[PDB]
Amino acid sequence: GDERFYAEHLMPTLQGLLDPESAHRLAVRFTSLG
Numbered sequence: 001g002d003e004r005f006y007a008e009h010l011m012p013t014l015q016g017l018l019d020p021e022s023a024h025r026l027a028v029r030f031t032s033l034g
Contacts, residue, residue, distance in 0.1 A: 016022040
């Protein structure tokens with residue numbers, strides 16, 4: 001794991017699993033799902 005662990009497990013993780021647009025978009029959907 002290098003290019004798929006440092007770019008596929010770091011970018012979408014550090015800048016996607018808690019991003020104001022990536023994490024908020026995937027969260028708001030579950031928060032306002034009903």
